[PDB]
Each structure stands twice: as structure tokens, then as C-alpha cells.
Design a protein around this ligand. Structure first.
Ligand code: MG
Lengths: 524, 524, 75
């Protein structure tokens, strides 16, 4: 198809208007006191929302180009969120902030390569200042604290998160189930989590989490690539009449069997999902057997002759639950024997004695941790379902933000952190005086998230900012109560990951745009 | 269908705008510090790329004519790449550089036939100067060196490439597989490669390489042309229920059975591909038997009566892998007996005693080399899949560039070589003073690639050029670090083939355009 | 500028024009950098007062027929 090609300035002016539309829509929700955005919907009444992520998801522009502009920032900003648990809006607000001023400069006659270098230097510097300003969050007292603050002043939530990390370690796997009674439970059970995402967004049954939750399903463990769908029918029809769902772990699942399974769940009979087996080569051989042991299933190997056609329900593994998302699979409560799992533990524990390389001793160590380490489940209790299915989500929010605080600590949450570092490195210089402009652009952009929060509240932003700048450390303005103080004591804190990720991603895409000379898209 | 016909100036003005759009989009990516191009995509977020080949692939213009202009340059520049391993963008940048100035000249009232002659002389001279400036790359020390430089300062890669050529000869066949462990392997195995491409671009399962990779498939060896699809079902259904793919080598495969097989893979049940048998006449008779021997299969001959309907799985050959591309088929690890292959070696070794003609002794010698010579596979190892499946590609890049260095030597890589030869032949003259204009056009066009690299970095091009011109041999500017030095010592070198191929192809199409008087295309 | 150069000097109207376009281009680029225009002006002006002093220094008299014929010629 014939394309439409834009160059240089025209391309960039387009890209700018695009992003400005996305940012202008999404930035108005930022505070604890956001303005609302009305999002139309086909059937029924519109949706009123103070939630940037929800607004962003809806933005798509008519003028392609303009569209690309917005879709580009949307992608980057989404990834901040993927790599933290928040920041999407901040990511966007900051991205707009650099892009606007960057693009204004290049258009003015300044060197795009220098402008980017400056922005990147200022960001590097700011990421350092952030690590410095970060307050560690290491002991159970601080874990619980950050947990309770994040779940909105709920001591009982922080207690649970802290108890889970207390039991399975800071690294250990923690999930959240629906509670059965009024009481919260914390059980530890035989399970595992590996770095593999779904093979299609079309398996998602929980649109909210953007995940795949499956109830007491069977697990298929195949050693080969799955292209054809014919070897599926002997097992896929035995689990059709067993009423339960089915999980597929194999080398891969190719378009032919995949696309049939994809339409076979949504609109279809048996609801199933599939993910690539963990690792590669010689690892996934034994790494897949690990799962077999845990779930009490059999591995369908090629080197033994076993084919998928010659497999029954008995050969399959089982768990009480399993959740798959963009890049993570985690299985919960394997039916695998305590004898069988302990036997496989002693088998690898032995193999660690090798020490042929510090690599091999470490890679076998990871397999032990996954298997013997287990998974900690939190059943969330409450008085009513509406109240409970809500609390659950709130815990999931806090759990996320906690794992991120444990990693890199916490900082002043009102976009205060960002203003702080920016005031610290006001002397930063480069070589080119165009490189300077670059830094000053990025510096100024760091005052944007705060200046915006304040504005969404109807307060003078200039004024609030100036006094937050006049302080030190984690002194800031709490917009919700209109008082100044130490943001962390007032319980207004972002994890450091998220503030940094927001900065870095905003910075990447901004630079990417200042260095774009050409855009290519389909004809209107 | 009624056509639209353009003549002379109009036709060329169109063609120019065409190429200018392609070049202007693609030239911005050239350096090690390219600007980005945003390439839209239907579903999901756009693609940001610094990669000319990828940009070029997308360009297609609305105004046919304009389109032809760009499609023309695209095809030529692609062929540079087909005959080297790189240069596509350089090919383009240079093609633009002549065409712009050429066409300006003809439009100004100068003789197209002379303008071309001048361009051609300058290129001839430059290709000579290039062979002079070139540095041989013959011994294992230099192979490994060029290998490591090409794989981006990775000594372990160069070692492997050098080890492969060390084992199977500089001419021998070398492929790259996915590694199973952390360690790199180099095995030699019974295999063969012949000059035959796929019978349809629709067999491609690896869109990246633009190739057809097939996993442990059966091989069908037919002596006749394949028009009808009826004689296929007895075998094509036995390999359907064997789960594995299937390769077809026959005299040909005609539209009738081809088009059914084409839609039968993409969107279809059994994934298969087909290629013409190597050679012609009396050669392909025995040349096909060679493959039969290697793969442990049977040849379905007409002169014995055997038909395709009367054939089983047992009659077919087998290999652990096979890759087909535009014009090359190569099979890896044939199941053929060591006794059977050695027997056929002794059979031909004998036949060499004939020496009825130096032609026959040479043609039988080529069949021995293919058969007994084998194929060297490189399994690439790494720590993680993302890291590995990447390294693999990087090796494939270096392997390519090495084979081309072995053939014609190496030169200063920053577009430096080009600027060098151009400064040498500044005295070159022709007969017509229009023929001079032609040379001066081509000469000036040779500074384009460097002048562009520099510009993509935001450095004065005039200035960098002038000082590279002021030196000698392989002195140049390294854009990545902004220092001058000996390009080869700093590890910035192109193989000589690629630089020459780029120049020649750019030059051909440019001349072709300067001599175009008429363009014919369908009605808008 | 070109007009005034002409009334005073009699020549240099192109140069004058080329300088003016240059200061403007560069000026505006700085104004877009956040610089205070009225200060960029004071800078320019001071640089010029100094340059004029320096030119007075470099200037050597021109009195012999040969030198005169040369300015005439380049003119
Ligand atoms: Mg004058």
C-alpha cells in the first residue's frame, strides 16, 4: 500500500500535536485531587474518571502521524508501569515536558544530537541524586509501613505483606486469592513462578488485571514445538468432558495450533492458555521436569518416543490455581507428592556439589529456590463481596509498590522528589551551549509533575514549587491537605523505582523524538 | 488496461522526486549514530528504527512514476546487499547523489549519453583505486580479526568463524544454529549446498532472514516436473501424520501443484517447501542421486517406471535441518549411511580418471567437493535466550562480511575509502566537456556517504571531509568516537566487495535513469 | 542597514546586509534559548564598540597612487 512520508520539521510538528493531545487529556487527572475526564462508551451512559491510565488507553487520533506521536509516548509510559507498578501519568506528563521544549529548540535552529546529550546527562545526574535521596526500606517495620501507606492507611494489609515476605523471603513468590471468610489467611504452599508470558492477549479472562486466572486446571508438559492441532484432540477432548481448564507448557505453540486455540477459548468450548517452557536448550529439559514433579505430571519427551496422541488425563499435572500475565507465569498448590518433590530436591542438592563453574552452581541453585521455596498465598477476608473483591485489588496494589520499595527504597511522593534533584543539579553544564539548553530543558521538565498536581488543585503552582524548592531532603507540599512537611512522615511516598522509571522512559522517548527525521504511514 | 505514458523531461522529473523520497527517508539512518525513522504498523505501537534496510522495505509511493523511481533504486540497492552482505543504504545514498546531479544536467541541456559515459569512466577508475587501497585478508589471523571487528569487538566470534574456515576451507559451507548450553560448539557434519532458491516467497517461515528453516524434515526426490497434485496425496498424507515438514526437490513444480502447496502451508495443514533440482540435463540425473545418497532416500525415476503415487516414507530422505533462501538451498546432517556415502565417493573418484575433457574432470570434481566436503555448523552459546538469539544474528552478520573479505580484502569503513579514491582521480578527463561534467558528478557523489555520516552526527560535514581528504591511505574520521586515525586499526572497515558493489549498482541505475526517455504505467 | 551604509560609506552595503542577517539569525536563536533580548543587545553593542576601536588600530594610511588604485580596483 502506498505510504505517506513526512520529513524533518513537518514530521515533528505532527508528532508534537499528537503528544500534546495525549498529555493534555491525561495530565488533568494527576493529583490526589484530579479533574475529571469523561470517556464516552457505546451502549449506556459515559464514564467519568480521574484515572490517567484509563484515559490514555482510550486515546487514538485521526490524523495518523499525530496519532504516532501519541501512541509513541503511550507505549513508553506504559512500560514505566510494567516495570514498577505506577508512573504512567507521570511518565506522560514529563515526556510532554521535554518533547515540548526539546522540539521547540530544534525547530529554533539548534542541534538535535547535542540537545539529546544534555537531556541524557541531566537524567543520569538526577537518577544519581535520586538514589541518594532514597530512604531504604529493608526491615519488617518499614515493609509493613510502606504496605499500609500504599493500601491507604490500612495497618492490616501491611501486616500481611510483611508476614508474607517474613515467611517466603523478600524474593519469594507472593499471590493474592479471594478469601472465604471474614478473616485474612496466609498459607505457604508448594508452587513456582517463571519468566514466561501468555502466547496471546486473547487468553485473558480477567480484563482488569490484564491476566489469565485459571481454576484447578490440568497441566500439559510437552517437550516439542506445537504447530499442528491434530495431536491435541485425544487430550483436549478428555479435559473437555472433565469440565476443567487446561494449561500448556511446551517449547512453543505455532500459529496453526495457536490460532485455533485462541478462537477456541473466547467464543469457544474449552477455555485454555499456553506459555513457552522456561529457559533454553539443556536447562528447559530439566527445568520442565521440575514443573512435572511439582504438579505430579509427566513430560512428553521426543527422545523416549512418547507423542501427544498417546497421552491421557493421568499423564497431566494439576494445581489449585495459576496466573499468567504479559511476561510471568506462576502456578499455585501442585498435586505433586511430598515424596516426589523432596526426592527431586535431594537430586539437585547433590548436583550442586559439582562446582565445575560458579555459573552451574548458581543455575542449579535457582532451580532449588523455585522448587523447595514455595509460594505464599494471601486469602483476603472482608464482610461483603463488594467490600472484599475491592480490598483484594488494594492489597495487590500495595504488594506491587512494596516489592519496589524493598528494591530501591522510597522517596517524596508529590512529584517532590523530582523537584528536589532538579534543584540540586542547577549547576550542571555540557560542552556545547546547545548541550546546556538540553540540560535546562530536562531540568525544568522535572518540575512538571508537581507543578501540575498543584494546578489540578487550583493553587498557585509557581508559589508551591518555589517553597518546596527552598527546603531540603524529603520536604514537600502535600496537595491533599495543603500542608508542607516531610513527605515520608506524612505518608506521601513513591517507590524509587517508579520515580526513576518514569524519568528514564519519559527521557528515552523524548530523545527518540528530537532525533526523528522521518515518519512513514499509510495513506489517509 | 489503458496506460499512462510520460516522456522525456516529465518522466524524469517524476523519477527524481521518487528517488529523492526514498533516499531522503533512508539516508538519515546511515552512521553508527543514525537519526530515527518511525515506521507505522497496523495493530499496536509504531516501530522506531535506525535501520535503512527496514525503512526502504516500507517505501512505496502514491504517484506511480514517482513510485517507479523509488522502486528502481530500491531494487538495485537491494542487489548490492544480495552480492556482499551490506551496502543497501550506501547504494541508495550514492544513487541519489549521481541521479540528482545527473538529471539536473540533462534537464539543463547536456548530452545524456556523454553524461553516462563520464560517470562510468569515473566508476571504473575508482573501482581500480579501490583494489589498490584494499588490504588482503587471507590467513587465519586476519580472518579472525575481520570476524571480531564485524561482530563488534567480540574475539570469541572471530575465533569461531576462523575455526570453521580452518576446518571446511574458505569455500566450504558454514551455517549457524541455536546453541544448547552456555558453550559455543563447532561440529562438522555430512551435508551439501546447491544454487537453487525457493519456488515461492510464501514458504518463508523466518521473515527476518527472509529464509525457510525446516526442522528434521523428510526429503522427496523426484525426477519429473510436478504439475498435478494428485500424485502427492499418498506421500503428503503420510508425512502429515508424521508431524514433520517435507522438502521437495524435482525438475520443477508447476503452478497447479505449486499454488495448492503455497496456500497449504501458510494458513494450512502440512508446512512444506519446494526447490528445483540442481544443474540441468545429464548433470541433475546424477546430481540428484548425490542428494539421495546423502539423505538416505530414493530417486523417483521415470525410466524405471516408479511414480509418486507408489512411494512411502521409507523412500524419502532425512536431515536434521535445512535452510532455503532467494537462490540457495543447503541441507544439514543427512541420515545417509557412512558406507553409502563413502561408496558413492569412490564411485566418482574413479570417474575422474576419465579426463576426456578438463570440463568433465572439473564438473565431477565439484560433485565430490559438495558430497565428501560436508557442512560446518556453529551452535552459538550464551547465558540467556534474549542474549543468545541475539548473538546468533551477530555471528551471521560477521560470517557474511568475512566471506566477502576473504574474496576481495577490506578498506576504510566510514565512507572513507570512497572519499579517498575520489581525491586520487581528481584529474580524470573525458572527450566531451559534457563527459567531464559526468565525471565530476560521479566524483562528488563519492563524498556523499561520509558527508552524510558526519551530518547524522551533527558535525560540520565540509570540515570533516576536508581533513579526511588531506590525509592518505586508510586515514579517516571515526564518527562513533569523533577521532581521526587509521580506520582499519580503529576497527572501522567495510569489505571491498561491499564498497565496490554499492558503487557499481548505484552507478548502473543512475545511468539507466539518465538515459530513460519514456515511462509506462497503469492509469491512477 | 544597506541603505545607511550607502549614504555614509558609498560601498559595503552587501557586507553590512550580510552581517545584519547574521547577528539577527544568531540573536533570535539565543532569544529562543531563554536569554534576555535587551542584554543580548548590550552585548552586541559592547562587542561592536570594541571592534571599532580595534579596526582603528589595524588601519594603515593610504596615500600613494598605487594603494589608491588598488581600493578602486577591488571596489
Ligand atoms: Mg563592493
Amino acid at each position: 500500500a502506498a505510504k505517506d512520508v513526512k520529513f524533518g520539521n513537518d514530521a515533528r510538528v505532527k508528532m508534537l500535536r499528537g503528544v500534546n493531545v495525549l498529555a493534555d487529556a491525561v495530565k488533568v487527572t494527576l493529583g490526589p485531587k484530579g479533574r475529571n475526564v469523561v470517556l464516552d462508551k457505546s451502549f449506556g451512559a459515559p464514564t467519568i474518571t480521574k484515572d490517567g491510565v484509563s484515559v490514555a488507553r482510550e486515546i487514538e487520533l485521526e490524523d495518523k502521524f499525530e496519532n504516532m506521536g501519541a501512541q509513541m509516548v503511550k507505549e513508553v509510559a506504559s512500560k514505566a508501569n510494567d516495570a514498577a507498578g505506577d508512573g504512567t501519568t507521570t511518565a506522560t506528563v514529563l515526556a510532554q515536558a521535554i518533547i515540548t521544549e526539546g522540539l521547540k529548540a530544534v525547530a529554533a535552529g539548534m542541534n538535535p544530537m547535542d540537545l539529546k546529550r544534555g537531556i541524557d546527562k541531566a537524567v543520569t545526574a538526577a537518577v544519581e541524586e535520586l538514589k541518594a535521596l532514597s530512604v531504604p526500606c529493608s526491615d519488617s517495620k518499614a515493609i509493613a509501613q510502606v504496605g499500609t501507606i500504599s493500601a491507604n492507611s490500612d495497618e492490616t494489609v501491611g501486616k500481611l505483606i510483611a508476614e508474607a515476605m517474613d515467611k517466603v523471603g523478600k524474593e519469594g513468590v507472593i499471590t493474592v486469592e479471594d478469601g472465604t471468610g471474614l478473616q485474612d489467611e496466609l498459607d505457604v504452599v508448594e508452587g513456582m513462578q517463571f519468566d514466561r508470558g501468555y502466547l496471546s492477549p486473547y487468553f485473558i479472562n480477567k480484563p482488569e488485571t490484564g491476566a489469565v486466572e485459571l481454576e484447578s486446571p490440568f497441566i500439559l508438559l510437552a517437550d516439542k514445538k506445537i504447530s499442528n492441532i491434530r495431536e491435541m484432540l485425544p487430550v483436549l477432548e478428555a479435559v473437555a468432558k472433565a469440565g476443567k481448564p487446561l494449561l500448556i507448557i511446551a517449547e512453543d505453540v505455532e500459529g496453526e495450533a495457536l490460532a485455533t486455540l485462541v478462537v477456541n477459548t473466547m467464543r469457544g468450548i474449552v477455555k485454555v492458555a499456553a506459555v513457552k517452557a522456561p529457559g533454553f536448550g539443556d536447562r528447559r529439559k530439566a527445568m520442565l521436569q521440575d514443573i512435572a514433579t511439582l504438579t505430579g505430571g509427566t513430560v512428553i519427551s521426543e527422545e523416549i518416543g512418547m507423542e501427544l496422541e498417546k497421552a491421557t488425563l493421568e499423564d497431566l499435572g494439576q494445581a489449585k490455581r495459576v496466573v499468567i500475565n504479559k511476561d510471568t507465569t506462576t502456578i499455585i498448590d501442585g498435586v505433586g507428592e511430598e515424596a516426589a518433590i523432596q526426592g527431586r530436591v535431594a537430586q539437585i542438592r547433590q548436583q550442586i556439589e559439582e562446582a565445575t563453574s560458579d555459573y552451574d552452581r548458581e543455575k542449579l541453585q535457582e532451580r532449588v529456590a523455585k522448587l523447595a521455596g514455595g509460594v505464599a498465598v494471601i486469602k483476603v477476608g472482608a464482610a461483603t463481596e463488594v467490600e472484599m473483591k475491592e480490598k483484594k485489588a488494594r492489597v495487590e496494589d500495595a504488594l506491587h509498590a512494596t516489592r519496589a520499595a524493598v528494591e530501591e527504597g522510597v522517596v517524596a511522593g508529590g512529584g517532590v522528589a523530582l523537584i528536589r534533584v532538579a534543584s540540586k543539579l542547577a549547576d550542571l553544564r555540557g560542552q556545547n551551549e546547545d548541550q546546556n539548553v538540553g540540560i535546562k530543558v530536562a531540568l525544568r521538565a522535572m518540575e512538571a509533575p508537581l507543578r501540575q498536581i498543584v494546578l489540578n488543585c487550583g493553587e498557585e503552582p509557581s508559589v508551591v514549587a518555589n517553597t518546596v524548592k527552598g527546603g531540603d531532603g524529603n520536604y514537600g507540599y502535600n496537595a491533599a491537605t495543603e500542608e508542607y512537611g516531610n513527605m515520608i512522615d506524612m505518608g506521601i511516598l513513591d517507590p524509587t523505582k517508579v520515580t526513576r522509571s518514569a524519568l528514564q522512559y519519559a527521557a528515552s522517548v523524548a530523545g527518540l523524538m528530537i532525533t526523528t527525521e522521518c515518519m512513514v504511514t499509510d495513506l489517509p
